[PDB]
């Protein structure tokens, strides 16, 4: 179990850690988050009480270093940093624990939600989507645009998701126009899985990362990416059986976790009705279809 200490909390802020969140008052004696499960990526995220605009946060994996938070004034935002002095770090954390100034990561023993949402998400892949090579952790916020959004403007602050475009020469083989547009199996299996992602685990990892950025930061381009990656699978007649079964589990836990009041903006009616009722895979997502029909029957 690892710890992310906070130097201080000078401004009132709602702090998220994965799917949990708590309010911290201006200059409240808050010094961080303990008992963070090892083995998973995590995200620590922020919404200032004064400007609910620009949710932001940091993806990290405590196996990769000792990380802490401190409100640097230059930029006006809580910043993640790495402490390279391991003895200085252990000594800081132990004092803050002894003074009980840390919240505990509040995982229920039975509860596999975070695992189920991050099963295929790897820090090394996050860092290729979010390019800032001098840090081991990755910054994401509500406003950041995707590489594809930039093609339709600062390249350093972009989300480098894999570009998917159903009406593109990459997606459509000369001579197979109708076939490839109506059955995207070629594009899924040969172009994307064999060629770009290499395996379905990396595909699912990017899909899960896109969803989480959409949910936690309201990042619109991430929502576009999540839906595009679902739609590419559902619009393929030929998908490995294990991929369809895993997709149904992935989406089930995503839909289960989504705040009920954010469904209007985070769920694309057209994609979901096509995927669950028109597509080749309309009958292959039983768990996802069941929770969608019981939780968001209006969208459908």
């Amino acid at each position: 179990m690892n710890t992310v200490p906070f130097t201080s909390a000078p401004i009132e802020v709602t702090i998220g850690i994965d799917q949990y969140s708590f309010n911290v008052k201006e200059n409240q004696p808050f010094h961080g988050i303990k008992d963070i499960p090892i083995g998973h990526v995590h995200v620590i995220h922020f919404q200032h009480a004064d400007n609910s605009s620009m949710r932001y946060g940091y993806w990290f994996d405590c196996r990769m270093g000792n990380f802490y938070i401190q409100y640097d004034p230059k930029d006006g935002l809580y910043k993640m940093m790495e402490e390279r002095d391991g003895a200085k770090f252990e000594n800081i954390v132990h004092n803050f624990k002894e003074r009980q100034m840390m919240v505990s990561y509040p995982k229920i023993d039975e509860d596999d939600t975070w695992y189920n949402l991050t099963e295929f998400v790897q820090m090394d892949k996050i860092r290729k989507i979010v390019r800032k090579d001098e840090n081991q952790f990755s910054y994401v916020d509500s406003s950041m645009t995707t590489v594809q959004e930039n093609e339709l403007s600062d390249p350093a602050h972009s989300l480098n998701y894999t570009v998917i475009n159903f009406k593109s020469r990459e997606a459509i083989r000369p001579g197979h126009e109708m076939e490839d547009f109506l059955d995207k199996s070629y594009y899924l299996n040969t172009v994307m899985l064999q060629g770009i992602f290499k395996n379905s685990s990396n595909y699912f990892g990017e899909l899960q990362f896109a969803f989480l950025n959409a949910m936690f930061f309201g990042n619109y381009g991430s929502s576009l990416q999540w839906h595009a990656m679902i739609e590419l699978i559902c619009s393929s007649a030929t998908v490995p059986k294990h991929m369809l079964d895993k997709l149904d589990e992935i989406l089930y836990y995503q839909i289960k976790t989504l705040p009920e009041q954010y469904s209007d903006i985070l769920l694309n009616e057209r994609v979901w009705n096509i995927c669950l009722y028109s597509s080749f895979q309309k009958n292959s997502l039983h768990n996802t279809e069941k929770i969608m029909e019981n939780k968001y029957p209006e969208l459908l």
Partner: protein
Amino acid sequence: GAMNSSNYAELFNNDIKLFVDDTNVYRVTVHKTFEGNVATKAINGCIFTLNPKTGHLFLKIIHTSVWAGQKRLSQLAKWKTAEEVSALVRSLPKEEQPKQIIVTRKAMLDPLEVHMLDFPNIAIRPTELRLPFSAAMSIDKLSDVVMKATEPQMVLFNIYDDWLDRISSYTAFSRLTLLLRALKTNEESAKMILLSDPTITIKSYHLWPSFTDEQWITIESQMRDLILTEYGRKYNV
């Protein structure tokens, strides 16, 4: 974007653009089987591809052999249309290729867009106009070459005959759409109007009769009457 009454004169500027109409690509007759079920049998069709500025018509005839062994013919027809239009563009010299293609039915947009990915600078556009190009097969010489075809064939026409020697392409298009609207609302009456006077003939190299300017005014008046009428006969007014 979409082509409508507002940007109507854009059809007659010197930039090359083509209308594509697919309504006569997939044509059948519906009949009863000996068992009393219903069967449809495909007959020859055509793509109607028209440059509205010059009158040049690229009539790609769709032989019945194209559907031999195929499923969901209505959907295939749209992709076959887009395939043939794309092949036509590639066959034209660069300076003759269109800068825009306007499809008369929105369902042609994605099939044509996908087939034209190689041509990112050619705009594929819908239209809000209700153009009467479906009635092209009421033009006797066009219907004749389609029905007689024994194989796939492209036949080139000028749908304005020699009208551009005397009128503008705006006016020629207006005459064409009036003639075709009439043929579509009451083909028998429209055809009666166009041939009633046997002294006015259709030249071998033309599609319509050799009316003088004054006779075209009369003809055009008679077609308007027909259309308003039928609109009464239809709605009772």
